[PDB]
Design a protein around this ligand. Structure first.
Ligand SMILES: NC(=O)C1=CN([C@@H]2O[C@H](COP(=O)(O)OP(=O)(O)OC[C@H]3O[C@@H](n4cnc5c(N)ncnc54)[C@H](OP(=O)(O)O)[C@@H]3O)[C@@H](O)[C@H]2O)C=C[C@H]1[PH](CCC(=O)O)(CCC(=O)O)CCC(=O)O
Ligand SMILES: NC(=O)C1=CN([C@@H]2O[C@H](COP(=O)(O)OP(=O)(O)OC[C@H]3O[C@@H](n4cnc5c(N)ncnc54)[C@H](OP(=O)(O)O)[C@@H]3O)[C@@H](O)[C@H]2O)C=C[C@H]1[PH](CCC(=O)O)(CCC(=O)O)CCC(=O)O
Ligand SMILES: [Ca+2]
Ligand SMILES: [Ca+2]
Ligand SMILES: [Cl-]
Ligand SMILES: [Cl-]
Lengths: 421, 414
């Protein structure tokens, strides 16, 4: 039967190393398991550290699992996160929650720190809503502080709201009048940010612009918040003058501070092709406008780059697609776009491979991104993208693939691509 | 024999401004308003020179004058920064006149694009206008902010006036370096006025109303906006809305921004102060031209209005003008400031002729531009800035003069 041992038909899976996975809710959870089953695990073996951030396990552990996941990301340097339920009043009723738990993304970000870089996932055949955006716009959202770690409260009636700083060294405290309510009640809030966090934010922004060869703009409202936003402006400018200016000049680019009002108009009018450093809230809100302006709200990458220069968390930024989940729970067909979740996995695994000098893993991660884009541009897509192209009322069943058909088509094309290489 | 009589005008609080907008303001009065309308103008000079001279008192005096006369029109003004401070040798870096007038008067700033058929939008589907109603009081614009110079505790406290024990909310314990911190507030009555003005504007335009907040994150602060609007709607407006086949909904700011991008327009968008400030720039630009916007502060008394030009004082054109070089400065926003004010004056005085005039001036502006006579910025909207030749646009004086010729023709025909 032949003295020479013939080669195996099954080929050796890639050693991918250590990865923290944050499991999610509803249809995104369904998608997440399909991605692992059909796209990752046949080709990559992982030392996978899985945390269930589904709403029921967050409730059971009093949100401790979210903290545990963040600490694990510190330890292993790579996290990949599925979309999760951020509960409102209805979710409190539906799950009999102990509390209207806060957004886990905010908790993870306030623990890890850094900058969330957000960018559209561009398909040649998905039309833009903004005509001129022929190059990408990359938002760098400062991931720490401000509204997302504030303390807000109802003022029940007349009285003084004051804000006080008490120096740790025992020198005199300073007290500022926020407002004397003399005619009724209202609301008040305190919020803050940290110098070191702002410095990390500036560093990540300058470095991303220099890595791309694109100009950088930071938006603030320092005309109104002269101290608070002026601190962002000053720290960026001093870091630019100290370390990065000659690097920008050598690449013929620039960094400029802009008022947020001007910056959103300028962005809308632009051709794309720049980095936009945003304070936490502005990056949160403006990335929705950028995501929708490129064609599809969900076709975004979202990667938290932590201040240590080694740790990354990639996530799907859209929601858990509740209506599709309900259909799926009744055995009905859905057409759920998995691209954002797939790219969470590929961006995470690409950083894993960079940390590990894993050439096989890096080739794989890029190959999966290529397969996803090429599949869509070849005309095989989920219903939402079909509607981007034709308009929802004109979509017919042959224009799109359902959730399982689309995953299977990606799996076929990934197998072809890895075979050809 | 009867003399040629100007249209009765009434009492208008004028606030004069700075730089190129001051120049075009005088041009508008001279060529478009004064030859046809006779005004009882109460003029306040909010030029940065007089604001430094009076220690910003003139701004407050103008705001009170508006309280008195119910109709105010405002030119663009310099909001000084460090550069302005050194340039004019200012005593202080005074706050923006707008912020002061708004804190004094209260109300909601309604902003909306001025649409010309030949000016292409940047957002494909916006075939109907989007009207933003920006709450004009509180939040960031009245906040107390400071630099935290080193390790220490920041807390924000509430002390009831009636003696009941205070409550202290920890903001942050800075253990390593320093940072920044800030308190801000809003008032129930001002939010209720905001809601009432939003519901009324929606009913008058016959469009649905969305309010945006971030109450996912700010459950108490933004929760109050949401709760107040929902209660005032259920109790006082839902039936009228349903009668006009419109509706009111709360939306998260993230959702609202994306859906507006993807929508057809045709709705009222109630915004917290900061969001209205920022999103209206985004909307203005998305319709084609950032400066083609009306901006009208509607005060809670339901009678007092302040119309302004929202854009800046066009400093580069002013420098050209100073050196006797021609400029192409678009005066439409300042014109519509005047016409919106005059239309409110006509409404208050039941002045048929003045209302006819204000609408006519708006029509003449739009038709002039749509007939192909425009300033350089709109030419560039059409052809793209690199492709604009001198023959594609009119300079500031030529455009003003063409508007005057067309306004004379329009008023004569009727
Ligand atoms: N990451 C996360 O963790 C998120 C969790 N959620 C949780 O998802 C749950 C529901 O969320 P909805 O908002 O109701 O939306 P949906 O996902 O149900 O989709 C609505 C309709 O659109 C269509 N459709 C959408 N995705 C599709 C897909 N893949 N394929 C195909 N069709 C798709 C489809 O339409 P048809 O039904 O007609 O086919 C579908 O029904 C609730 O529990 C939310 O809390 C929401 C968003 C983020 P996000 C954090 C962002 C950040 O951290 O930066 C804000 C997003 C933003 O800012 O833009 C939460 C806010 C916070 O945490 O503060
Ligand atoms: N309302 C006001 O009173 C404002 C006053 N200012 C004060 O104006 C001063 C300068 O301002 P810049 O920011 O440098 O801009 P610019 O006006 O000089 O134009 C820059 C370039 O664009 C082009 N161009 C613009 N307008 C054109 C026009 N008509 N025709 C033709 N081409 C035109 C042209 O381009 P070329 O040169 O290539 O031809 C030109 O050079 C500074 O001193 C500022 O303080 C700024 C804006 C508002 P704003 C209140 C908004 C609100 O309350 O609703 C925030 C802006 C926003 O939110 O949208 C600040 C005050 C506050 O904080 O309250
Ligand atoms: Ca967002
Ligand atoms: Ca603005
Ligand atoms: Cl299916
Ligand atoms: Cl001229």
């Amino acid at each position: 039967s032949g003295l020479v041992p013939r080669g195996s038909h099954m080929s050796k899976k890639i050693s991918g190393g250590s990865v923290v996975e944050m499991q999610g809710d509803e249809m995104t959870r369904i998608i997440w398991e399909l991605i692992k089953e059909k796209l990752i695990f046949p080709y990559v073996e992982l030392d996978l550290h899985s945390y269930d951030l589904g709403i029921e396990n967050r409730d059971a552990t009093n949100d401790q699992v979210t903290k545990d996941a963040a600490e694990a990301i510190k330890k292993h340097n790579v996290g990949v996160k599925c979309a999760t339920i951020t509960p409102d009043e209805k979710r409190v009723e539906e799950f009999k929650l102990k509390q209207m738990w806060k957004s886990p993304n905010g908790t993870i970000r306030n623990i890890l720190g850094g900058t969330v870089f957000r960018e559209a996932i561009i398909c040649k055949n998905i039309p833009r809503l903004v005509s001129g955006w022929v190059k990408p716009i990359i938002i760098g959202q400062h991931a720490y502080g401000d509204q997302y770690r504030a303390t807000d409260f109802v003022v029940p009636g007349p009285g003084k709201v004051e804000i006080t700083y008490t120096p740790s060294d025992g020198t005199q405290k300073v007290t500022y009048l926020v407002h004397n309510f003399e005619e009724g009640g209202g609301v008040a809030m305190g919020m803050y940010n940290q110098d070191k966090s702002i410095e990390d934010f500036a560093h990540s922004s300058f470095q991303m612009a220099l890595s791309k060869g694109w100009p950088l703009y930071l938006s603030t409202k320092n005309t109104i918040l002269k101290k608070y936003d002026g601190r962002f402006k000053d720290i960026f400018q001093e870091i630019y003058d100290k370390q990065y200016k000659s690097q920008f000049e050598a690449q013929k680019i620039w960094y400029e501070h802009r008022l947020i009002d001007d910056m959103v108009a300028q962005a809308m009018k632009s051709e794309g092709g720049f980095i936009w450093a945003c304070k936490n809230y502005d990056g949160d809100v403006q990335s929705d406008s950028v995501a929708q302006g490129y064609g599809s709200l969900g076709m975004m990458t979202s990667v938290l780059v932590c201040p240590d220069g080694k740790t990354v968390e990639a996530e799907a930024a859209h929601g858990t697609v509740t209506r599709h989940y309900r259909m799926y729970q009744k055995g009905q067909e859905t057409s759920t776009n998995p691209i954002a979740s797939i790219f969470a996995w590929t961006r995470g695994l690409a950083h894993r491979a960079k940390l590990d000098n894993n050439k096989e893993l890096a080739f794989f991660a890029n190959a999966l991104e290529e397969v996803s884009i090429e599949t869509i541009e070849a005309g095989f897509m989920t219903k939402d993208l079909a509607a981007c192209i034709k308009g929802l009322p004109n979509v017919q069943r042959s224009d799109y693939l359902n959730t399982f058909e689309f995953m299977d088509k990606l799996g076929e094309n990934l197998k072809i691509k890895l075979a050809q290489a």
